[PDB]
Scaffold this active site. Structure first.
Site, PDB file in Angstrom:
ATOM      1  N   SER A  63       0.835  -1.190   0.000  1.00  0.00           N
ATOM      2  CA  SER A  63       0.000   0.000   0.000  1.00  0.00           C
ATOM      3  C   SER A  63       0.870   1.240   0.000  1.00  0.00           C
ATOM      4  O   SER A  63       2.067   1.176   0.332  1.00  0.00           O
ATOM      5  CB  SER A  63      -0.884   0.028   1.256  1.00  0.00           C
ATOM      6  OG  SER A  63      -1.615   1.239   1.357  1.00  0.00           O
ATOM      7  N   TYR A  85      -1.771  -0.264  10.920  1.00  0.00           N
ATOM      8  CA  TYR A  85      -1.908  -0.617   9.507  1.00  0.00           C
ATOM      9  C   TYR A  85      -0.608  -0.310   8.764  1.00  0.00           C
ATOM     10  O   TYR A  85      -0.057  -1.170   8.076  1.00  0.00           O
ATOM     11  CB  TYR A  85      -3.079   0.136   8.868  1.00  0.00           C
ATOM     12  CG  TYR A  85      -3.324  -0.234   7.425  1.00  0.00           C
ATOM     13  CD1 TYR A  85      -3.730  -1.526   7.079  1.00  0.00           C
ATOM     14  CD2 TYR A  85      -3.172   0.705   6.410  1.00  0.00           C
ATOM     15  CE1 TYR A  85      -3.956  -1.883   5.761  1.00  0.00           C
ATOM     16  CE2 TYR A  85      -3.394   0.359   5.074  1.00  0.00           C
ATOM     17  CZ  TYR A  85      -3.793  -0.939   4.761  1.00  0.00           C
ATOM     18  OH  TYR A  85      -4.021  -1.304   3.459  1.00  0.00           O
TER      19      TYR A  85
HETATM   20  N1  LIG Z   1      -8.650  -0.537  -1.156  1.00  0.00           N
HETATM   21  C1  LIG Z   1      -7.565   0.234  -0.989  1.00  0.00           C
HETATM   22  O1  LIG Z   1      -7.621   1.644  -0.937  1.00  0.00           O
HETATM   23  C2  LIG Z   1      -6.207  -0.377  -0.837  1.00  0.00           C
HETATM   24  C3  LIG Z   1      -6.047  -1.700  -0.424  1.00  0.00           C
HETATM   25  N2  LIG Z   1      -4.799  -2.255  -0.253  1.00  0.00           N
HETATM   26  C4  LIG Z   1      -4.609  -3.689   0.054  1.00  0.00           C
HETATM   27  O2  LIG Z   1      -5.301  -4.507  -0.878  1.00  0.00           O
HETATM   28  C5  LIG Z   1      -5.587  -5.765  -0.288  1.00  0.00           C
HETATM   29  C6  LIG Z   1      -7.040  -6.175  -0.569  1.00  0.00           C
HETATM   30  O3  LIG Z   1      -7.946  -5.240  -0.025  1.00  0.00           O
HETATM   31  P1  LIG Z   1      -9.155  -4.563  -0.845  1.00  0.00           P
HETATM   32  O4  LIG Z   1      -9.462  -5.349  -2.064  1.00  0.00           O
HETATM   33  O5  LIG Z   1      -8.858  -3.120  -0.947  1.00  0.00           O
HETATM   34  O6  LIG Z   1     -10.374  -4.713   0.205  1.00  0.00           O
HETATM   35  P2  LIG Z   1     -11.402  -5.961   0.257  1.00  0.00           P
HETATM   36  O7  LIG Z   1     -11.960  -6.029   1.621  1.00  0.00           O
HETATM   37  O8  LIG Z   1     -12.416  -5.843  -0.823  1.00  0.00           O
HETATM   38  O9  LIG Z   1     -10.523  -7.287   0.026  1.00  0.00           O
HETATM   39  C7  LIG Z   1      -9.894  -7.929   1.110  1.00  0.00           C
HETATM   40  C8  LIG Z   1      -9.878  -9.422   0.830  1.00  0.00           C
HETATM   41  O10 LIG Z   1      -9.119 -10.091   1.815  1.00  0.00           O
HETATM   42  C9  LIG Z   1      -9.848 -11.204   2.313  1.00  0.00           C
HETATM   43  N3  LIG Z   1      -9.424 -11.516   3.688  1.00  0.00           N
HETATM   44  C10 LIG Z   1      -9.435 -10.699   4.794  1.00  0.00           C
HETATM   45  N4  LIG Z   1      -8.927 -11.399   5.836  1.00  0.00           N
HETATM   46  C11 LIG Z   1      -8.590 -12.645   5.405  1.00  0.00           C
HETATM   47  C12 LIG Z   1      -8.035 -13.759   6.039  1.00  0.00           C
HETATM   48  N5  LIG Z   1      -7.633 -13.690   7.312  1.00  0.00           N
HETATM   49  N6  LIG Z   1      -7.802 -14.914   5.300  1.00  0.00           N
HETATM   50  C13 LIG Z   1      -8.113 -14.976   3.945  1.00  0.00           C
HETATM   51  N7  LIG Z   1      -8.666 -13.873   3.324  1.00  0.00           N
HETATM   52  C14 LIG Z   1      -8.892 -12.727   4.043  1.00  0.00           C
HETATM   53  C15 LIG Z   1     -11.317 -10.879   2.119  1.00  0.00           C
HETATM   54  O11 LIG Z   1     -12.028 -12.045   1.830  1.00  0.00           O
HETATM   55  P3  LIG Z   1     -12.830 -12.930   2.916  1.00  0.00           P
HETATM   56  O12 LIG Z   1     -13.561 -12.056   3.911  1.00  0.00           O
HETATM   57  O13 LIG Z   1     -13.781 -13.748   2.079  1.00  0.00           O
HETATM   58  O14 LIG Z   1     -11.844 -13.804   3.654  1.00  0.00           O
HETATM   59  C16 LIG Z   1     -11.278 -10.009   0.870  1.00  0.00           C
HETATM   60  O15 LIG Z   1     -11.438 -10.780  -0.301  1.00  0.00           O
HETATM   61  C17 LIG Z   1      -5.239  -5.639   1.190  1.00  0.00           C
HETATM   62  O16 LIG Z   1      -3.978  -6.247   1.405  1.00  0.00           O
HETATM   63  C18 LIG Z   1      -5.142  -4.140   1.404  1.00  0.00           C
HETATM   64  O17 LIG Z   1      -4.316  -3.808   2.499  1.00  0.00           O
HETATM   65  C19 LIG Z   1      -3.677  -1.530  -0.501  1.00  0.00           C
HETATM   66  C20 LIG Z   1      -3.726  -0.206  -0.912  1.00  0.00           C
HETATM   67  C21 LIG Z   1      -5.020   0.510  -1.131  1.00  0.00           C
HETATM   68  O1  LIG Z   2      -4.482   6.544   1.425  1.00  0.00           O
HETATM   69  C1  LIG Z   2      -5.467   5.843   1.773  1.00  0.00           C
HETATM   70  O2  LIG Z   2      -6.530   5.729   1.103  1.00  0.00           O
HETATM   71  C2  LIG Z   2      -5.384   5.089   3.069  1.00  0.00           C
HETATM   72  C3  LIG Z   2      -4.965   3.674   2.848  1.00  0.00           C
HETATM   73  C4  LIG Z   2      -5.742   2.803   2.165  1.00  0.00           C
HETATM   74  C5  LIG Z   2      -5.410   1.356   1.914  1.00  0.00           C
HETATM   75  O3  LIG Z   2      -4.013   1.089   2.025  1.00  0.00           O
HETATM   76  O4  LIG Z   2      -3.676   3.388   3.451  1.00  0.00           O
HETATM   77  C6  LIG Z   2      -3.258   4.591   4.097  1.00  0.00           C
HETATM   78  C7  LIG Z   2      -3.465   4.498   5.610  1.00  0.00           C
HETATM   79  C8  LIG Z   2      -4.562   5.463   5.301  1.00  0.00           C
HETATM   80  O5  LIG Z   2      -5.411   5.962   6.010  1.00  0.00           O
HETATM   81  N1  LIG Z   2      -4.316   5.620   3.928  1.00  0.00           N
END
Ligand SMILES: NC(=O)C1=CN([C@@H]2O[C@H](COP(=O)(O)OP(=O)(O)OC[C@H]3O[C@@H](n4cnc5c(N)ncnc54)[C@H](OP(=O)(O)O)[C@@H]3O)[C@@H](O)[C@H]2O)C=CC1
Ligand SMILES: O=C(O)[C@H]1/C(=C/CO)O[C@@H]2CC(=O)N21
Ligand SMILES: NC(=O)C1=CN([C@@H]2O[C@H](COP(=O)(O)OP(=O)(O)OC[C@H]3O[C@@H](n4cnc5c(N)ncnc54)[C@H](OP(=O)(O)O)[C@@H]3O)[C@@H](O)[C@H]2O)C=CC1
Ligand SMILES: NC(=O)C1=CN([C@@H]2O[C@H](COP(=O)(O)OP(=O)(O)OC[C@H]3O[C@@H](n4cnc5c(N)ncnc54)[C@H](OP(=O)(O)O)[C@@H]3O)[C@@H](O)[C@H]2O)C=CC1
Ligand SMILES: NC(=O)C1=CN([C@@H]2O[C@H](COP(=O)(O)OP(=O)(O)OC[C@H]3O[C@@H](n4cnc5c(N)ncnc54)[C@H](OP(=O)(O)O)[C@@H]3O)[C@@H](O)[C@H]2O)C=CC1
Ligand SMILES: O=C(O)[C@H]1/C(=C/CO)O[C@@H]2CC(=O)N21
Ligand SMILES: O=C(O)[C@H]1/C(=C/CO)O[C@@H]2CC(=O)N21
Ligand SMILES: O=C(O)[C@H]1/C(=C/CO)O[C@@H]2CC(=O)N21
Lengths: 245, 245, 246, 245
Positions: free
Chosen positions: B140, B153
């Site tokens: 991220s 986080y």
């Molecule tokens: N959205 C954003 O702004 C950003 C997101 N990220 C990263 O992207 C990744 C995905 O998140 P995002 O798609 O945004 O959000 P979502 O919640 O849509 O996706 C998260 C996924 O992770 C799964 N999950 C959570 N906990 C577990 C677990 N313990 N075991 C197996 N699966 C798990 C969920 O599925 P289920 O509940 O079915 O297990 C879900 O499919 C994360 O690593 C997040 O930190 C990074 C930067 C920006």
């Molecule tokens: O910039 C953002 O949207 C959010 C985020 C989202 C998922 O990594 O990560 C950093 C921590 C936070 O609040 N920022």
């Protein structure tokens, strides 16, 4: 005595950097709560410091234990009247490849180095906010630079740094200073705990040819940071052995 | 079809970035093992992908479960013949101040984002070594930049980055590529999980005024990285919303 | 007490601010000080003060951007004071303003002084530092660690100083030359008076008006701590921020 | 052809990465203004691209020349109708120790790598603002990691990164995308210019035992970044040779 009437809580005080730091802060007039798991070593240090005219509170504590953390902080404030300085020094370094690693190495390092430090920080925070105090995080070169066979250890120390910078942003305006100390190779008991035998020996040979930093050098860095005027936050001190590229 | 005959295992595939990535890799001809906790959503995606001509292996998995991780990797290799691409995308973002935090937020984020990722990495490694494959870490902006109310986080994501760089140093010469994707604000379910209500609301308002990255944009970053020639490791892609300072 | 008795320190940018405080601090530790900058009148006044306090002072009129002037200033210092143990590369200017339609003389001035001048001084001093197993102190900034709007080129110079200095550390550390990098946040000096972009100068002044600023003396104390550390310890980075400033 | 009707100005287009980038962008349908000092090599490339159906504007330019920079940008907009993409690729790498260095190495690197890039950025900006275009900075692994005998080179590349992040903060809300490409070892003419003989030879040996990145790989990174949807700014791509720790 720049710290007269101040209270410092030092985790990992039973040996190494924490022991030297507790001595250094007590020498500046601070009352010291010394926390670790080896109570007999803490008692021996506590006797030495008390015999030197310091006020000491001995705390048997596992920093990974959230309940124990909360009780340790409460015990300190009760016994010594408040909390001005927290030194999150408790830590372990378990080196070895990621490949086929003993993952108990990982859970131990995360519990102690990361979660334990965060728990202690959180529990101390209400008291530090009232005293406009200082939290000192014992990070590492491992929080600034990545080398082979230290992946999870480096993950914890980079994590500590990010946690601590974020904390600074959150609390600095209310006068809680966040200090991060980043030592390179320092001659302590730390390396004796490495569970991967091949890496333990590799590391020992690597650091055999340098003058290592001393525990007292790092204590001096902490002393410099905490005795700085309140308007100054020495957020990072990165101290390396001169002999080491 | 740049990935014909390759096998990709994607954690967190039930929604958001992981769902888009699984689609993208399948579109490139990869067989996809899709892993998450909500089996119903995985089955629905698996049906859609199979209906589109893809080879799908559905895995009910909690990445925080060490034993479940080992079994999920073994199941994938048994069902699909090997492992070429691991996408460590499972993650949770629980925002809020450090002060008086619900520490279960912390343990959940560490278990999923950090420990889970490291577990999956370790279990996949023997297979990736044989296939000279690629591990993609979903980090991220939070692994690059610290903002208020995301301390733990950000700790996990900076930790992911350090772990991954170190991993690269350890395995790169044997042809295992380590790719780290760092999205900024992306329109997913992620934010719905924040347990601190005031922070959840504050974050929603903060991101309400920008065109957010789409899950498909991040999937494209992954696709670009994994389809690059083997001699090139795209170690970091830092992708930000253009509207966001 | 006097941790630096018999040592020689050369301090660039000594006529005001951080460099002035650092020269006083080092002299107070017993170091002979060569003080270098362009305003000779101010140097002479400081030199008089330090000499009257019992210090050994060598006044150097120097533009750090002047390669030949740099070489002569180092040679003059070693001739007058017997050697060189500590170099403080403190001379610097901060010219803030947007990239868009910038006065590019801002840029050339900052690069000449902050980056090239520091590198020239480092290079000229190095043979002497190698002999004495001395310390070079680089005056970087928060601007070498974090980027904010309207400081693009200044931040380029300071990030540049840090990379130059880390690389230098790798090259000379095993021969006992310590590389120290000091990174102050907002410090109450003459620095900001020089900003040529008027709107940005005003914007910056308002932003820093709400904090207790670091004092030049605080930064001098950071330098003092780093150079008086035992030789086996290289305090490579001290990042000091105003507590009041997020 | 994702760049149909777009205009790209590429500095350092006479060889290496700039040459490959000019080809790649022209292949996407962009009109290309190609700039460097060796006119003969530019004309040969210009002939090649024009014979392949591209629109080409040949510019003899030294990027260290502020007035030459201003004229080059004006010439480009006059001849091709506007400016949508700037690639700041012109650069030189003069390796050697700091000790006793030939300081003309330093002034050359600063003039070209840093000041020339900044001049070009500034002159292009009014046009990029109108077109909500993209500026691509050709940085390096040397803007991310420091190794011995590259002090001043690394200074310029770390400088480019800081300059460019700051630029992003300043212009991103007006739709000007700032992209920074950071290649590791790439097989170009770059190294042939090193003036320190011993270091030139040391560097050649260092990179002799890896599959180097190809100029075309880097061009592909640029292409991915500039063809990303406007709401996405791929601010950093860090590409390493897989063989290189
Ligand atoms: N959205 C954003 O702004 C950003 C997101 N990220 C990263 O992207 C990744 C995905 O998140 P995002 O798609 O945004 O959000 P979502 O919640 O849509 O996706 C998260 C996924 O992770 C799964 N999950 C959570 N906990 C577990 C677990 N313990 N075991 C197996 N699966 C798990 C969920 O599925 P289920 O509940 O079915 O297990 C879900 O499919 C994360 O690593 C997040 O930190 C990074 C930067 C920006
Ligand atoms: O910039 C953002 O949207 C959010 C985020 C989202 C998922 O990594 O990560 C950093 C921590 C936070 O609040 N920022
Ligand atoms: N030595 C070095 O080269 C460097 C060390 N560091 C850091 O310095 C810190 C101190 O280690 P160091 O002095 O080097 O080595 P030591 O082993 O001597 O110190 C570790 C200390 O932490 C305590 N400790 C370990 N686990 C726990 C726990 N679960 N709860 C409470 N206390 C605990 C130990 O006491 P007990 O067993 O009695 O509980 C011991 O006093 C660590 O954070 C380490 O990462 C950083 C950079 C360099
Ligand atoms: N003030 C702040 O908030 C911070 C400052 N810094 C750094 O501290 C350093 C000192 O600046 P500071 O004390 O703050 O502000 P000042 O303006 O008070 O000090 C600048 C000093 O550098 C000298 N100088 C400027 N240009 C040259 C040159 N071309 N050749 C020789 N000397 C020169 C000036 O003297 P003269 O004009 O006589 O030559 C003056 O003594 C700078 O490098 C700055 O980047 C870092 C972090 C924060
Ligand atoms: N190759 C590698 O391992 C890596 C290279 N880089 C960067 O890639 C960029 C291009 O270098 P690369 O292709 O590798 O090497 P090349 O030497 O082949 O290309 C450099 C280009 O810049 C031009 N150039 C040099 N000085 C000037 C100037 N003053 N004004 C205008 N043009 C100039 C040269 O053409 P001419 O002489 O005709 O002017 C040439 O076209 C550089 O910024 C370099 O730092 C970054 C990471 C890795
Ligand atoms: O440089 C060293 O001595 C050791 C170390 C020691 C304790 O932090 O941390 C980093 C990880 C490693 O092996 N380095
Ligand atoms: O934080 C500040 O006060 C100033 C500063 C001051 C001197 O380096 O440097 C960075 C660039 C900027 O505007 N910051
Ligand atoms: O890794 C490498 O090949 C070279 C390099 C090459 C072009 O930037 O940049 C860094 C400085 C150096 O010697 N490294």
């Amino acid at each position: 005595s720049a710290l007269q009437g101040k209270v410092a809580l030092i985790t990992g005080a039973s040996s190494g950097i924490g022991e030297a730091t507790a001595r250094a802060l007590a020498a500046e007039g601070a009352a010291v709560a010394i926390a670790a798991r080896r109570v007999e070593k803490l008692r021996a240090l506590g006797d030495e410091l008390t015999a030197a005219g310091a006020k000491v509170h001995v705390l048997e504590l596992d920093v990974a234990d959230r309940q124990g953390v909360d009780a340790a902080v409460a015990s300190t404030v009760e016994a010594l009247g408040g909390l001005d300085i927290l030194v999150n020094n408790a830590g372990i370094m378990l080196l070895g490849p990621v490949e086929d690693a003993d993952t108990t190495d990982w859970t131990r390092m995360i519990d102690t180095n990361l979660l334990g430090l965060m728990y202690m920080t959180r529990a101390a925070l209400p008291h530090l906010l009232r005293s406009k105090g200082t939290v000192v995080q014992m990070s590492s070169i491992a929080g600034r630079v990545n080398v082979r066979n230290a992946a999870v250890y480096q993950a914890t120390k980079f994590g500590v740094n990010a946690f601590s910078e974020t904390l600074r942003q959150e609390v600095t305006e209310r006068g809680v200073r966040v200090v991060v100390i980043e030592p390179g190779t320092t001659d302590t008991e730390l390396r004796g705990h490495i569970t991967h035998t091949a890496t333990k020996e590799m590391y020992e040979q690597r650091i055999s040819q340098i003058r290592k930093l001393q525990a007292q050098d790092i204590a001096e860095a902490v002393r410099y940071a905490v005795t700085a005027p309140h308007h100054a936050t020495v957020h990072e001190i990165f101290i390396r052995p001169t002999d080491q590229v």
